[PDB]
């Protein structure tokens, strides 16, 4: 029978398992079928896909971080172009502009899912600060002065943190200075997404406002020598009052209560990302699939994309990931109006915004990971004293970078 093979990326500690979950039906109506997936790391996955496409040797399909499909679609040759072989009216608009190359008429991803990061809170640490999470991390200024009474109050058996988040060079680093970006009013890109436009006075106004936070020692800065993964994990086991997250964490946490009766699931909320200057803005990622020019199962590979954006594939890839999915009809299912996951929806429904799509950006997210990761490195004072003035020049450098990479 014909043996699809596909690349995944992780976001929970059973990848594959959870992926043929998903397929079984799949596999089940089409038993000529099967196919067999193989995380790659995220780290790893950007180099990997690339040399996929230039050598020849690959998978039939392969996840791919949303902001990179231009990247990826705009090498000669590399994935088979999809526009009119998926019926698209079925998704929800708003997540097919990163299938595209931007300017281009031209798809060469299937959206698959959907995610966005919200404040996590916690409901123990908050009633013991005086803070009201309905409210009280309704704005950025309202945000930091509940985070002035969360810092250092001793909950349980030891003195939390504000706010917990990640420093260390990973891809969200520059997805966790967006939003602060786009809510202080400035943007990585012009409307045409060919030129670098992060140094404006209202872009230097959300990162002096985010990192500043550290300076202020409203965030944890030991957790900025630390990854994406560390804090989440950190989080779970209750060492901060605050974390902007994706909704994957939720499973995490609810295995960890039904492995040990680690309880922090028990004692989390979730609220949208703090209003800035600008209005509420939020970051909206995700994943799509594609195909490899390469495959020599061109046929079944497009039949399996067509049941990945299958409403009941959509539904129970979400119940099992707790990502959000990218077909409307997935969210007449009840499962969504859990209070967590609302959350989720509403914020990327009416307040999220993706990068632009277009083919140099995945380079321009290794140069930001480098380049505002020095940032964190200021504000922990390793080489000198911390100096906004500093901040200003480093992010001076990699606008200038990313101009060249456009
Ligand atoms: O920037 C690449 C890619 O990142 C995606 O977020 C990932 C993140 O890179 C990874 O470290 C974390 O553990 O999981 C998230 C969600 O899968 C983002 O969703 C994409 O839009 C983006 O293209």
Known sequence: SVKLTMWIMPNSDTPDQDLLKVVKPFTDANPHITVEPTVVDWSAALTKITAAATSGEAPDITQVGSTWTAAI????????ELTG??????????????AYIKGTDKMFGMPWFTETRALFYRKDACEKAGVNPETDF????????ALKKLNGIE?????????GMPGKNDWNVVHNFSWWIYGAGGDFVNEEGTQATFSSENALKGIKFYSELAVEGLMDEP??????????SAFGDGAYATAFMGPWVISSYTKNKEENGNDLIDKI???MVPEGPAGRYAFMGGSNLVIFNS????????????????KEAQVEYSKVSKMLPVVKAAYEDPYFEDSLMKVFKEQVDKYGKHYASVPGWASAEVIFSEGLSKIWDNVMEVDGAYSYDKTVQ???????????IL
Do not use: H, P
């Not at 480093?394 to 060249?404: L, T």
């Open 73 to 80: 679609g705009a090498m000669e040759g590399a994935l088979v």
């Open 85 to 98: 072989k998926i019926d698209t009216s079925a998704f929800v608009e708003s997540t097919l502009q990163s």
């Open 138 to 145: 309704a704005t950025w200024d309202k945000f930091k002065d």
């Open 155 to 163: 909950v349980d058996g030891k003195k939390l943190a504000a706010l």
């Open 223 to 232: 957790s900025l020598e630390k990854n994406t993964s560390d804090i989440e």
């Open 269 to 271: 909320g979730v609220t």
């Open 295 to 310: 495959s020599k199962n061109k046929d079944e590979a497009l039949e399996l994309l067509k049941f990945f954006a299958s």
């Open 394 to 404: 480093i992010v001076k450098d990699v606008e200038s970078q990313i101009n060249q």
